[PDB]
């Protein structure tokens, strides 16, 4: 199975700092990765699919990058709505495992 | 003995199909280039002329090469100090090609739209082949075009003969010059199929056989009885 | 004794006339044989080029030419497209860049697929052609009851399918692919394998009434 | 002759020169598949009838294998043999004009740019009852102007045939495929329109019912369809 | 050495002349056989049509 | 059957390659004869027109005789009292010949530069043969021209088609007349080699394949998934 | 066949219709001098490879007698036979597009009038690693636009050949002399550019190394040079 290790676990940043969440896989995903955003008691929403392509209804602050095994989620100039837990999920080989998760808190 | 009754000769004579009027003036602060009459495009419509419509609709199908003679004459009803020597671009937009929205569009310099540059007071002359999509034009269409939805019953794009667009190539003077353009279409190599009944009633629409309501009786009454000669 | 006709002194831009040469007696550089002389644009649209059927990305990439295949999927659809070759997946191909220079095409197409997964993997894909006027299929069985090829990926690595003569300018036809069998991957080789799709023109392809794309 | 069998159908008729081949052109390819007699519901020619109008191929759109292949295949190409038979005694008078009009584009009863709806331009086996009331979106039904603004007397330039009940009771009009394209969609476009118009009104004797049936029997002949849906993809 | 005659640069509307084609190399849609081709209007007035002799309405 | 798809017909049609504007006025106290628009020279560059550039760059090599139609139209947006009867010298500067720096240079009377003298409102027409130095023009050049040093990678003098220079032969009146000149090039006897990929991205330079940065994706996205028809 | 000896070189290969003669024109004069197989350094097709691009005759500029005569003589004229071989097991998948582009003028990664430097337009035996970072003065390496602003799918109009590792592992493209001049300076101008582009990515099984060598073997054939430097002055 392809096991996603999403580093770090939690981040403290202000509204305007740059957040770069990271996922690294055991196997090779071949850019078939999806990033998710979730709030407290809300459903997860899709931000980036195919490790670079922003989904529908996603602002241009988010930017998926990375290829192969390591994938970065760079977020530039944070807003107030952009705090929550962020999960990778690869969609390559069934099972579609998640990562650990990166939460955002305010300094 | 009957060479005037040929459809090459009955349908094949130069009629006045369009009279437009464009102006030579500056576009400085001009929003609409049609209300200013900086240019005019015209979807080529021989059924706009009800004398040629009533002759074409004596047949179901008609196939002809076209022949356009364009006469541009100027007019300066203001203070002018001189009659300007003007050049008109008479641009033929083929069927399926985009029409101009401005007089300084990209369409005027498009190489696939053939355009004639001629002087005002002189006359243009060119010929367009059969640019229909069927093997003949449809004077009447019992049905719908391209779609299973509502497609207006007889309004079809098979009868698209193109479009003529007209502007003055010249820039402005200090006076406004009014060029009136008369397009003269002559159907050539005419051939026609399925002769129909002559239309008795006047028209209300183009491409539709709709006649006006509460109109007058076309069969005229005798001055006496049926026995009166 | 002559009379000037109407249309004298006009410049009809499309009227090709001979002209006085501005450099008479100039001997130009001689013609050598360069290979690959193209007389006709109907010569070069018969060359098959890749189709970006995986348009699902917001950017251009090589992955858009790759039709993804997935294991443990039976009776699903692989891809599906209409066959308007002026819009959609065909708008940027060599066929559809030269089709959109003109107005009316009216010919047969040559549609190819190429399986690029491993030599031990095998599947059956069923390749449905829906003609114009009809509805594209919405299960694998409606695809089989129409025009199709059951293409065994294990045996035939490249299939070539000639789309019938159309005059297509819903409409223009559809073209889908369905999983007859699930994709059987070689052992401990799991993930996705890809198809490469190609479009060209059959030699009866015409093209007429040249127009102008803008930007 | 009098037992004309076409498929599993058979009709009994009379002819000596009855077939009106339209424009002297017999229908021909560019039978034995859908070629049978489809016999429409008999219309009742009462004394106050104004006429009936059937669109073809729209009158045969639910008619078995023909109407199946009409909606299965997009493109098609058919000619017709239309028998209009108005059986009567030797006491009825009256005259029908059975006329076939290629591309009978109808006029709406509201004028202007108002067009006729698909419900009414494609009425099916029922046809258009020209003696009924104008409905919203329907054609104009004024029979003197042939539903298209052209007078009823000039309708004889189209391929027609009279049914003078004094003389005969049948009219046969052999229609070819008349279109400006070699093949066309049969479901969105009507090639011809059969009209059956009483010019001289039906007069019955005293003691007869003031009504008389009219039977329209349309046999599609030289019917072709497009090669797609059976052309191979290989 | 030529001399332009009177009536040069005129447009007599009834004078049928050939013209430069605005779409050369354009191959138009081919002619199919539509039945009922009319060459002459003396063909179609020989078809008898009804007379409204009862004009009294 | 396919005579519109010939490269004689696809590449061989009169497009608008240059629109300049020269003025008739006096050179009394005029320093720059280009800022005053007393004349305009133009290095003949068919890749300046991005519609003809995108068609020529469908091939690697192209060899054609040229055909220039020049339309000069006047304009007097000031007080004028008359429309002047003007004559334009349209001088073809061949490749390797010097261009004018003034409107009254020696170059205008140079016998080896062919020049056309025509009236404003009328039209000029002449043809230039294949004036390239190779056996065809280079739409693309993978390398350097004439030198072992840096020679800009594809900027080569093999594709020099000449130059067109335009002035008004007439002297000044008391009013300024503005002549706008439209050059119409038609590639004739066209023959082409090595068909290339069509260019998807827009242009940033002439003679360079450089596309703009952070541009838009040319392959357009579906409204659904890959299974959506 | 499988021991093709050209000069003192010998390669082992497979072919049934493998040679792609470009534009159906075999290279011919306007061998036996510099005609041997020059075997470039094998590239490592990893899983995240974007492609490689070699300019010809620039890839053979240090290659023995050919690269000696390339800088000795100014003008030259050569055709090529390019073998691209990607040896693999029957467990690898993936697809290479081995394409030959005449006059592949490259695009700079800065846009505008910025041109690509001679260091990068002439990279030698190394070629252009399209998966590396854009350097100052180098070409753009975005493989979707073929380094020239034209899409990757339309690259099949050039003389190409696929290496589908499912099907084969070799691609042979026989390149003629393609130029608008009969002879040209081989040191300032590249006639063709060989590109080897992975369209379908390299997938290895579990237990295999995620990389695969690609060997490019260029044999210059029908190589001519100018008659000067041996023409007599008398």
From Swiss-Prot, chains B, F:
Compartment list: Virion; Host cytoplasm
Signal sequence span per UniProt?
none
- Which superkingdom heads the taxonomic lineage of this protein's source? Viruses
Q: What does this protein do?
A: Forms an icosahedral capsid of pseudo T=3 symmetry with capsid proteins VP2 and VP3. The capsid is 300 Angstroms in diameter, composed of 60 copies of each capsid protein and enclosing the viral positive strand RNA genome. Capsid protein VP1 mainly forms the vertices of the capsid. Capsid protein VP1 interacts with host ICAM1 to provide virion attachment to target host cells. This attachment induces virion internalization. Tyrosine kinases are probably involved in the entry process. After binding to its receptor, the capsid undergoes conformational changes.
Query: Subunit info?
Result: Interacts with capsid protein VP0, and capsid protein VP3 to form heterotrimeric protomers. Five protomers subsequently associate to form pentamers which serve as building blocks for the capsid. Interacts with capsid protein VP2, capsid protein VP3 and capsid protein VP4 following cleavage of capsid protein VP0. Interacts with host ICAM1.
- The protein depicted here goes by the name Capsid protein VP1
Which species is this UniProt entry from?
Answer: Human rhinovirus 14
Residue range from the parent sequence: 628 to 856 of 2179
